Ligand binder design. Structure first.
Ligand SMILES: OC[C@@H]1O[C@@](CO)(O[C@H]2O[C@H](CO)[C@@H](O)[C@@H](O)[C@@H]2O)[C@@H](O)[C@H]1O
Ligand SMILES: OC[C@@H]1O[C@@](CO)(O[C@H]2O[C@H](CO)[C@@H](O)[C@@H](O)[C@@H]2O)[C@@H](O)[C@H]1O
Ligand SMILES: OC[C@@H]1O[C@@](CO)(O[C@H]2O[C@H](CO)[C@@H](O)[C@@H](O)[C@@H]2O)[C@@H](O)[C@H]1O
Ligand SMILES: OC[C@@H]1O[C@@](CO)(O[C@H]2O[C@H](CO)[C@@H](O)[C@@H](O)[C@@H]2O)[C@@H](O)[C@H]1O
Lengths: 322, 419, 319, 419
């Protein structure tokens, strides 16, 4: 209740507590932030938050330099505090104001400590969902990206690891949820496609097969979100095509554009090869038109891939439909 | 240095320098001449640019022009004289005859050469030929009239076509109701714009003015009276757009020359009158090889026949045009036929273009409306998506609110956060 | 002996029927299988014509024995350069041979298909294969079936080895002698539409030397053709290095053709390729590798335009 | 008929026809005026084509009205205006404003005449009040003159300088291009062999103006020029030479200047500073402290006669390089302008690059034709071999006593041999 105790907490935090002593403090702090009025929080406020994060930074740093780690408890308790601290408009706003706060949340996403990754992924997902500021998703992603460059790993690794067969249903649902939270709020179709295609290259598609089997309402909800969002992206891509057909109906003007697009790119030679092969299409009055139609079906099914992802460029077999 | 090439090559005709005074301490002094010499060089170089009796009558100029002509022609001087008397077209040609007329000695020179027909083998080859021609009575008239006959069929076909074209054009125009339509439409639209003007209530305008419709532009010079009339036809009277097809000969008529035509015919009638007068002065043929008067009377008949067909067609053509002028109200005498069909040909071409330009304008206008539509649909689609995101957490009102985060998380758990 | 050759000509022209016609043709056969070439010249064209007048009468109308016998005489008659040459000079000789290919009478068809096959092989005249083909066409037009139907029926399961082998060999005799690669591919592809591919899979199971031989000939030729078409591409790469020039050529080819709309739709879809630095070249590559499997189709045949699920393998065959 | 539209429309100024003497039994007499009428037609049409104080005592009538308008748009106190001019307050002055004042200022006599009526000031019109104020500023016209030259000085310095830089650079790029020098030596060589035995033979150099003409010397069959030949030599045996066009980067800019205009333009900046120098030496001593002329135009006349000197440097230098180029490549600098010389060189450079390019296309085309000829022989040999193999089965011509011709053929088919 006291308003002085918020100042005391700030001081204990900076006092150099370790192990079960630091933990017993965090646990008290978690409880204070969860029971007092928002005004108490404001008193703790930024300097308090910063104190939480300095510790979190020390802990993530001693766990990179370690082998067996009882640490989980303190790191995770700090995550529980952050939730409490962000359980109001002030704390959220204060958090986003930090320089390293979102990054630290990301680094708490370690699939080996599932319940901590779960809690940290929820908060990240909440941030993505926000109306203000603009493009919270891209900021969360920027941080995931920075963690990835430091550990030197694919930035979506920890999420795919969390979906693998061994892990709890709770962790899967949390990983999908954060994927959904990164993709769904983005306004630009190309962006949704980029990200989704990226997750697929990392094995997202096979994992999805497994998760669709699980009899779990929370899991179904996230799958339906992901699927529906993919279908809507396909529907948009198809609309770009209708637009192109309407606007670009002149062989020359389209050719010049395709050219301008691939010039000075690894794609140029491929295009030249394609044209050359069309010259090789058997010169027969019945068969030529059918060659071209077959080719056009093949091109269509590649460029307009279904489900708003890129084709799998490593998969070496295709089934063109007719 | 000094070279010595086997093959003389083409050269750059520059203006040279010589070391003596011409050089000093310039660029040219410090030039090593063998610095670029190969024998292969001069090889490739020499490859590309290498540079691989007695006269008793005729003057000296005529005997020489014949000495030439004759050596080339090569034909028994007797055979020649024969093909000229018979008028044997199996051997005669237009060129052949013209060379003869140009190469031929003067009539006096031939006079003095057929009085020397005693010493024939004694003469130069250029006078042996001249003796042989000194025989044929009425030589030059013979040749001219022959030439004319050789040219007649061809000079008819440089006349008939044009009279045909122009007649066709004149008919096509008078019979095209789709063209008449366009005219009526134009008077209508024009009479409205000229309301209260001195030009108000017109019963017609001069048909020459058509190429000027285009000159009448809207406020923003984006549209003309011609495009307007053409769009009107396109939208509400498609039948009119077919008038350019009902005037297949107008283009050919615009290319004619009524003057050259009038002359061309007038010359043909003189050329017949000339032949006619050479047949009516001609010595009765001595020998049976002289099938002239025979063949030319046959000819002067057929010729006057065809000529009179032509003069009909042409007097008719002039009448059509004069009546065109009565019908569309203009002074035929002020405007040559071609000038007139050119103005019409130009108009037709302008109209075809206006139609085309209209179609491209309408396309460009669709493009711009469809963009407006999709861009506006977009500002809505998103504004609406943004509004749904603000229904989750209003980041601006109640501060002493807790459970903000627990709300976001329940929305996420349940699906509600996603739309 | 030479007296009875003039006789045959008058026996064939007398209107013999059934077993009388038959015993005359059986003798005619042995006379032809046994007397020196000079005896055949003495039977000659006028006698060939009468076999053929009868052949045409029979076809127009258990005739089997009579027709078939005429076919054995033909084989005998044309077992020397004189007979063959004379055969070729006939207006409807090759056509009637064609009409003898009734999968109903397996042994008649076998014999006619060998003669026709032999005809395709000749160096002179030029392009015998095409004249055989022309006849196959004409028959086909008057029965209202596909010109290669009879050939395919004979390849079908219940039919004897000999007939199978004979149909494949005639097929090889129409294709292999052809100069132009375009022609061979045309014909092979026409057979494939009629169901050839599936029939060959069944004949591959049969242990039979004669059959293996015709199959090896047929396959090797596909291979040589495929290889030749790969060469066409190597040339193209050498001569058409220029976007504009290639573009214009394709354009002239497809213009005013059922192919124009597709080519436009191809170019329009390419504009849809995701505008990403990494993915864009991969799209184009992938498109390119599928276009290659389609256009340079294997075994010198067109792709199966009728399959509703076309399969494309862009993994390497050999390493 | 008769209309009465609300808005005047643009019209066709055609020449109208009236029913009277104008019509007779023509096309127009049989027209139905209402045949095309709509109220919508006239609507579309109306849319597109619619059509939308005090007495003078000195100043002449014109000047008064001009000043009346100018002082109306200007809108500043006649006392303020006086101040800016005296102080030379550069925070207010503009090229624009000082060029208006010079334009509108009454004659000096009209100011002297108003300066003698400074008594009736409130009674005078605006135009003359201004006149009385300015009739005060001593040596007004020189003062506005000098003030402008200063406002413009910077800008006119930089229409002179960059040109003097271009010519200087180009002059250096040339003198120093060994790749260009090479091309000259190679040209001299070739030229000399070509001219071997002519009056031009053994030349120690040619005049560099001549380069643009090398191309004028064609081969036997005019398919090849001396310039393409020289350019092939370089491509094949001296690539470096092909880089001389890049070593001459300023040549194009130099080709576009004007020696005459720099000379004039610099000499005028000389007289302009000598006109403002003396306008500071005859200048009356300042009566009041706002007159910062004799002060600031002495700080200018120093800095300006300073930059002029630096340009005069570069310019005397530049000219020297061109006179030196003339000594080095042996040409009269005085008979040929700078820009003319560099235009000739610039042109040649282009000719060269282009000859190079055309050579390549030529070689590509020679390749295509050769490979095509190889393939045509490969095929003719392919089919002959394949035909010689077909004839090893049978020669339909040799001996006819053979039976089993057709048994042979079937054993071939049967075994594979036939294939
Ligand atoms: O850093 C994110 C990112 O990198 C880019 C460009 O390098 O692509 C790469 O990074 C992804 C993982 O983020 C890997 O899959 C790569 O293979 C790759 O080169 C770019 O796409 C971008 O957004
Ligand atoms: O219009 C989009 C679209 O059409 C479908 C079914 O007709 O495929 C076809 O249309 C395309 C391009 O969209 C061509 O590639 C075709 O060959 C074709 O019949 C369907 O796939 C669909 O999404
Ligand atoms: O008569 C041979 C022939 O007909 C053409 C053109 O009509 O092809 C048709 O006939 C073939 C078989 O002969 C069938 O496979 C068809 O599908 C077909 O339309 C033709 O190309 C040609 O040479
Ligand atoms: O040259 C024909 C050809 O090469 C193969 C195997 O290397 O494919 C390569 O070349 C094709 C185009 O011809 C490209 O699509 C490649 O991606 C490729 O590696 C083979 O398929 C074949 O027929």
């Amino acid at each position: 209740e006291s308003s002085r105790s918020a100042m005391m907490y700030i001081q204990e935090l900076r006092s150099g507590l370790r192990d079960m002593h630091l933990l017993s403090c965090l646990e008290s702090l978690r409880v204070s932030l969860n029971n007092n009025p928002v005004s108490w929080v404001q008193t703790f406020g930024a300097e308090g938050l910063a104190s939480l994060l300095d510790i979190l930074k020390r802990l993530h740093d001693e766990k990179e330099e370690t082998s067996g780690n009882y640490d989980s408890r303190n790191q995770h308790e700090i995550i529980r505090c952050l939730k409490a601290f962000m359980n109001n408009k002030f704390g959220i706003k204060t958090m986003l104001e930090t320089e390293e706060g979102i990054l630290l949340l990301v680094r708490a996403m370690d699939p080996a400590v599932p319940n901590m990754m779960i809690d940290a992924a929820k908060l990240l997902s909440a941030l993505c969902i926000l109306p203000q500021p603009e493009d919270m998703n891209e900021r969360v992603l920027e941080a995931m990206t920075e963690r990835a460059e430091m550990d030197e790993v694919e930035r979506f690794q920890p999420l795919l690891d969390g979906l693998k067969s061994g892990t709890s249903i709770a962790l899967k649902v949390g990983c999908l949820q954060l994927i959904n939270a990164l993709i769904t709020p983005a306004e630009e179709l190309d962006f949704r496609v980029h990200i989704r295609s990226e997750l697929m290259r990392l094995g997202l598609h096979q994992v999805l097969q497994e998760l669709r089997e699980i009899e779990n309402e929370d899991m179904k909800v996230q799958l339906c979100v992901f699927d529906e969002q993919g279908d809507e992206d396909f529907f948009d891509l198809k609309g770009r095509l209708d637009d192109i057909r309407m606007e670009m109906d002149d062989f020359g003007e389209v050719f010049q554009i395709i050219l301008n697009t691939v010039k000075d790119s690894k794609a140029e030679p491929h295009f030249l090869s394609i044209l050359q092969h069309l010259l090789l299409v058997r010169n027969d009055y019945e068969a030529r038109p059918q060659y071209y139609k077959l080719i056009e079906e093949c091109v269509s099914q590649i460029v307009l891939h279904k489900n708003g992802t890129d084709p799998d460029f490593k998969c070496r077999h295709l089934q063109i439909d007719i | 240095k000094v070279y010595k090439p086997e093959v003389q090559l083409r050269r750059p005709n520059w203006s040279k320098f010589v070391a003596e005074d011409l050089s000093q301490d310039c660029f040219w002094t410090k030039v090593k001449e063998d610095r670029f010499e190969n024998n292969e060089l001069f090889a490739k170089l020499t490859l590309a640019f290498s540079a691989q009796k007695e006269l008793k009558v005729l003057d000296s100029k005529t005997a020489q022009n014949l000495s030439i002509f004759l050596g080339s022609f090569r034909m028994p001087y007797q055979e020649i004289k024969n093909v000229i008397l018979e008028v044997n077209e199996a051997v005669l040609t237009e060129s052949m005859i013209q060379n003869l007329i140009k190469q031929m000695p003067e009539p006096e020179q031939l006079k003095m050469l057929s009085e020397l027909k005693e010493e024939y083998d004694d003469l130069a080859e250029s006078e042996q030929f001249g003796v042989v021609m000194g025989t044929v009575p009425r030589l030059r008239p013979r040749l001219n009239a022959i030439l004319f006959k050789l040219q007649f069929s061809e000079q008819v076909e440089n006349i008939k076509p044009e009279i045909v074209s122009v007649t066709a054009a004149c008919e096509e125009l008078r019979k095209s109701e789709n063209f008449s339509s366009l005219l009526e439409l134009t008077l209508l639209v024009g009479n409205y714009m000229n309301a209260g003007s001195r030009n108000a209530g017109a019963f017609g305008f001069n048909i020459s003015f058509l190429c000027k419709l285009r000159d009448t532009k809207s406020a923003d010079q984006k549209m003309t009276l011609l495009h307007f009339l053409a769009e009107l036809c396109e939208n509400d009277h498609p039948e009119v757009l077919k008038f350019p097809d009902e005037l297949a000969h107008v283009e050919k008529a615009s290319r004619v020359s009524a003057e050259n035509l009038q002359k061309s015919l007038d010359q043909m009638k003189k050329q017949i009158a000339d032949v006619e007068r050479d047949v009516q002065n001609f010595p009765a043929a001595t020998d049976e090889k002289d099938k002239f008067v025979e063949k030319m009377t046959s000819f002067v008949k057929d010729a006057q026949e065809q000529y009179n067909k032509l003069r009909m067609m042409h007097s008719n053509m002039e009448t059509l045009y004069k009546e065109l002028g009565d019908y569309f109200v203009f002074d035929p005498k002020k405007l040559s036929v071609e000038e007139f069909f050119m103005d019409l040909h130009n108009f037709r071409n302008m109209f075809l273009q206006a139609v085309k330009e209209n179609q491209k304008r309408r396309e460009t206008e669709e493009k711009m409306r469809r963009a407006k539509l999709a861009k506006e649909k977009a500002e809505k689609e998103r504004l609406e998506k943004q509004q749904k995101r603000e229904q989750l957490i209003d980041m601006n009102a109640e501060g002493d609110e807790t459970g903000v985060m627990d709300s976001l998380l329940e929305a996420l758990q349940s699906g509600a956060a996603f739309r």
